[PDB]
């Protein structure tokens, strides 16, 4: 409904055909850091559990409900719009929880619950922790939460901060410059070459790096998942002021994202960092086609703009300048095509 | 709307999304196998070109057509569905041939040619020639052929032959034992152990491998590009009696394809074979289900069963038996999900 609205079907069934897959529901549940702080988050918050009424959102395998479960929830609704829906019943048979585990097929925006329930939790997250738009259902899914119910996880951190790479740089640039060639098999691409470039600099680039490459300390945005409303994701505005600690030329932004459970016993924080152990998520780089020159002590400013799109992703925009030399830098970047390079 | 009528809408826009990235169209032009001898076929045939009026079916970049330019060709068109058709305009004008080349954005099933040509050029090939089902495409051009006018390519051969390959055969399932685990964080996977399994062996595998994986001379399939109908290939049927080579166990069918373009100075070859260079079509390989095993001097007998599908590709269904022990095997397989094990 508001799914459908917000979702082309050419997307939305490539997508829930995409989980359907058991090798990329592994891909997660294999991730050891994010499978096993969701179960520690939830098992030592037992008393957000114990008893209580869960739903989980898009649940995949079904893994984080059987968590639930462990943690002494006395019922779970587990809503998942592909087909893994069936597989994740099968599970619940097989590990006899019939009784306290229900699958539920459909989208949270389309089925019925037959109640309220005091927590959700969910594993919404995609890389640059917004893509897929996911967040959207998770929030939207607050219908169904009793009044001063939880959500787990409870709120979200995306890190942004200017970085010097030029071995990157220049791998996207060489790709690119094919199209710079005068005379491919004595044909002439060169007046391509300005397309190619914006096409390889649209796409994110994700996998880890070294720390080092950072020029600045992070900023942070954040969501509030207590309390976000759905709308409040179509456009993300994040301003940035950064104070250079390095100089060197800055060749774009990496992102990487934090959430915490915060639980009546402790809070719990999963963190996709480039300081952390790697997670499925690794992190994400937007290059700049043009780098800017910085010294330490410059500030470099700028926005950095999400705009959601009918594709179940983002489009993104990307305005930085060095203050002291006004050298700008604008970029567009496709969430929807990524570059994994690792 | 012919092709409208066999194509799912979504199938169609992902499919000639894909083709708008210059980055893909780069992907085949790098293959210097393909795009060189491309080149080569058309200029030593430069009588089949001089002076001739020429059709491209799916120019892409218009690499093709700017072949049959330089061959001397006096018109051609050089029709293109996807945006990619914009940049291959760009690409006429700073080439200065817009006198010669005329770009007609659109499928060709559903534009209009102001007249008939001489020869048809296309390179709709696939993954096991006929993934995509562009072939169909090329074949509908017809419609635009003066009589006795040529294609190139004017003929292909599939090939497929018995292959062994213990390692490949085992990994399906070591990688699907993933599941096979009774406290995943607590919870036994191993219900799905099987759908995993299936899973793995619905998809084809692209990659190369060395040839005495093979075990029989291959049979051979061919398409006359001249005189075959769109519908011949809505459902092929390969039969298939091979007489081993070598004894051992056979895991699978191992593909690969040949063309011919038979110019009026010479025929020339394009081989996506295992025992020539590698091009960007790889090879393809079928798992069995289950092994057969087979002494050299027996004979592996069966039918590759080739069924099209509205997402541009094909179910693919295999029979096989050892005739002298009526030990027997089949598997169905999605082309359209390929695993690029390369
Ligand atoms: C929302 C959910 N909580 C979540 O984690 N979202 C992201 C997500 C979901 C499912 C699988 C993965 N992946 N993990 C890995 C591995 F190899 F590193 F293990 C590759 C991978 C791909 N392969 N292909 C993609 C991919 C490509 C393009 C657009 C995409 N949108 C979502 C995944 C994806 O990811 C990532
Ligand atoms: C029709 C045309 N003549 C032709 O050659 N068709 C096949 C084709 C067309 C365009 C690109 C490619 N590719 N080349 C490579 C490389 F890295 F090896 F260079 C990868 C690749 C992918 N990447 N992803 C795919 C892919 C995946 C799943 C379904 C698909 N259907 C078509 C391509 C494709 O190919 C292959
Ligand atoms: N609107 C929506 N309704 C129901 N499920 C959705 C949905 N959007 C995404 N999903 C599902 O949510 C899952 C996201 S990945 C998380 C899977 C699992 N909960 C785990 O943590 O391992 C996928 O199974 C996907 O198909
Ligand atoms: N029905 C159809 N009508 C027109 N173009 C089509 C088509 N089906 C596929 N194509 C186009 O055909 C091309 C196949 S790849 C070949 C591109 C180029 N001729 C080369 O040889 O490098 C793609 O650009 C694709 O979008
Ligand atoms: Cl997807
Ligand atoms: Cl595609």
Tied chains: 1, 2.
């Excluded at 098999?185 to 096409?199: I, Q, Y």
């Excluded at 600045?216 to 709308?231: D, H, I, Q, R």
Aim: charge should be negative; aromatic fraction near 12%; proline fraction near 4%.
């Amino acid at each position: 409904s508001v799914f459908s609205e917000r979702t082309e079907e050419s997307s939305a069934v490539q997508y829930f055909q995409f989980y359907g897959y058991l090798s990329q529901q592994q891909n997660m549940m294999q991730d050891y850091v994010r499978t096993g702080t969701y179960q520690r988050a939830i098992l030592q918050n037992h008393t957000d559990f114990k008893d209580k009424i869960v739903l989980d959102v898009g649940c995949g395998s079904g893994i984080l409900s059987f968590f639930a479960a462990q943690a002494g929830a006395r019922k779970i609704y587990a809503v998942e719009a592909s087909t893994m829906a069936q597989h994740a019943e099968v599970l619940v048979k097989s590990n006899n929880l019939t009784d306290r585990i229900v699958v539920i097929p459909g989208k949270v925006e389309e089925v019925s619950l037959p109640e309220q329930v005091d927590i959700i939790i969910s594993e919404p997250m995609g890389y640059m922790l917004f893509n897929e738009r996911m967040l959207e259902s998770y929030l939207h899914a607050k219908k169904y939460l009793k009044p001063s119910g939880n959500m787990f996880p409870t709120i979200g951190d995306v890190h942004l901060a200017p970085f010097t790479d030029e071995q990157l740089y220049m791998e996207q640039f060489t790709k690119a410059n094919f199209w710079y060639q005068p005379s491919f098999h004595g044909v002439d691409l060169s007046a391509l070459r300005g397309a190619a470039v914006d096409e390889y600099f649209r796409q994110p680039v994700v996998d880890t790096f070294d720390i080092r490459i950072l020029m600045a300390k992070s900023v942070k945005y954040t969501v509030n998942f207590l309390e976000a409303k759905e709308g409040d994701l179509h456009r993300i505005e994040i301003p940035f002021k950064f104070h250079m600690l390095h100089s060197g030329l800055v060749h774009g932004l990496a992102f990487w994202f934090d959430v915490a459970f915060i639980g009546s016993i402790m809070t719990v924080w999963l963190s996709t960092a480039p300081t952390e152990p790697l997670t499925h998520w690794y992190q994400v780089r937007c290059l700049f086609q043009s780098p800017l020159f910085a010294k330490a002590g410059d500030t470099l400013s700028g926005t950095c703009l999400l705009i959601a799109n009918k594709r179940q992703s983002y489009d993104i925009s990307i305005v930085a300048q060095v203050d002291q030399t006004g050298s700008k830098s604008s970029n567009l970047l496709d969430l929807k095509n990524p570059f994994f390079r690792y």
